[PDB]
Structures are given as structure tokens and as C-alpha cells.
């Protein structure tokens with residue numbers, strides 16, 4: 037009924053949308069992994085009379101439900117999707133997207149990691165993102181590679197028309213007390229990568245983490261703090 041939806045409010049399999057700004061929504065879904073249930077976020081950005089999707093809804097059935105929710109709530113076709121790293125909360129559902137006519141994209145790094153781990157593989161490679169600090173335009177967003185953090189391939193997304201920073205899994209919510217799933221992380225580089233985000237996007241007004249509640253720029257400093265303490 038208006039607040040940002042939380043893990044216990046979303047049954048696994050359904051998707052909620054949350055209006056972030058004009059032409060910008062987050063999508064929220066839940067999934068089971070290793071016997072626990074987790075929420076996860078993605079982004080939808082209006083691109084004229086089409087939509088750009090950032091990240092799947094963490095699985096094939098969730099991603100089908102995402103498409104149905106977009107049709108109900110927004111009613112514009114999703115034409116392109118970008119996955120921000122290779123884990124299943126970002127690429128799981130790419131095969132559903134590809135069968136619904138969505139062109140799927142990811143960096144070459146993400147595509148290689150997805151293939152090696154047996155996850156779904158976006159069709160198209162995003163060049164121009166291989167060095168930390170690189171940025172490219174993709175429709176109504178900028179894609180930015182901050183360096184290794186949550187994963188070596190993680191991308192962040194900025195919506196310049198709205199000053200919305202989608203940090204993906206490189207950014208944690210303010211309530212986080214640990215650095216999430218660190219299986220493929222670089223805890224030593226992560227603060228430096230967050231510092232690159234802070235320097236590149238100082239006018240961000242909303243910051244969206246990969247999991248949990250949006251806030252403002254404080255999410256970035258909080259992330260650096262929880263990662264430094266996890267490393268210790």
C-alpha cells in the first residue's frame with residue numbers, strides 16, 4: 037500500500053513494482069536459495085514508448101511474472117534488458133526474456149562468468165566497460181564499471197533524467213549488517229570501487245541497492261563500512 041515492499045511481504049513467484057521517479061520503477065521479487073528466502077531488486081526505465089529492463093527477477097517463473105506485472109502496470113513493451121553481473125538474481129530468467137522478444141545484454145566479463153557457472157547467458161556483449169571508471173550510454177541510462185566489488189564484473193546504472201543510481205549488488209541497503217553473499221567478491225577492492233561510484237555520481241538523489249530498500253547517497257558509505265568490517 038505504498039511503502040517499499042519487503043521480503044516477508046512478497047511470496048516467492050510474485051513481483052511488485054515501485055515507482056522511483058518519472059519513468060523509473062524498481063522491480064522486487066523473492067527467491068529461495070540454500071534454504072532461505074531473499075528479496076532482490078531490478079530496474080525498469082522508460083525509453084520513449086518502450087522499456088529498458090535492468091536485471092531479471094531471479095528465476096524463470098519470477099521473470100515471467102515480472103513481464104506480466106509490467107504489462108498490467110505500465111503497458112509498454114520491454115525491448116532490451118541488461119544484466120549487471122553473472123549471478124542468478126541478475127541473469128536467471130534471461131531465457132524467458134529472450135523468448136518474449138527482449139534483446140538481452142551484458143558485459144563480456146559477465147557473459148564468460150555466466151557461461152562458466154552454468155547460468156543463463158545474455159545474447160549481446162557490451163563493449164567499452166572493461167576498465168574501472170568506464171562508462172557507456174545505453175538508451176536512457178549510463179552503464180558504469182566501478183571495479184571489482186560484489187563481483188569482478190558488477191556494473192552500476194545511472195538514470196540521468198532522474199538522478200537515480202542503481203548500484204546493483206555492489207551497494208547494500210542501510211539496514212545491512214554484513215556484506216551479503218560474498219562468494220565471488222573482492223572485499224579489499226570493494227571500498228575503492230564504491231569510492232569511484234561516489235566520485236562519478238555525486239548528484240544522485242536515489243540510490244537503489246541490489247537487495248533491500250532504496251535510500252540516498254549514504255548507502256554508498258554504509259556499504260564501504262559493512263564491507264570493511266566483514267573483511268575484518
Ligand SMILES: C[C@@H](c1cccc2c(-c3ccc(CS(C)(=O)=O)c(F)c3)c(C(=O)O)[nH]c12)N1CC(CNC(=O)CN)OC1=O
Nearest residue numbers: 069074123124125153205208212213214215216217219247
Ligand atoms: C544469487 C546470489 C545470492 C544468493 C543468496 C543470497 C544472496 C545475497 C544476499 C545475502 C544476504 C543479504 C543481507 S546482508 C546485506 O545483511 O548480508 C543480502 F542483501 C543479499 C546476494 C547479494 O549480496 O547480492 N546475492 C545472493 N549468489 C549466489 C552465489 C553463489 N555462486 C558461486 O559461488 C559462483 N557461481 O553468489 C551470489 O551472490
Ligand SMILES: [Zn+2]
Nearest residue numbers: 121123186205
Ligand atoms: Zn551477486
Ligand SMILES: [Zn+2]
Nearest residue numbers: 125205246247
Ligand atoms: Zn545480489
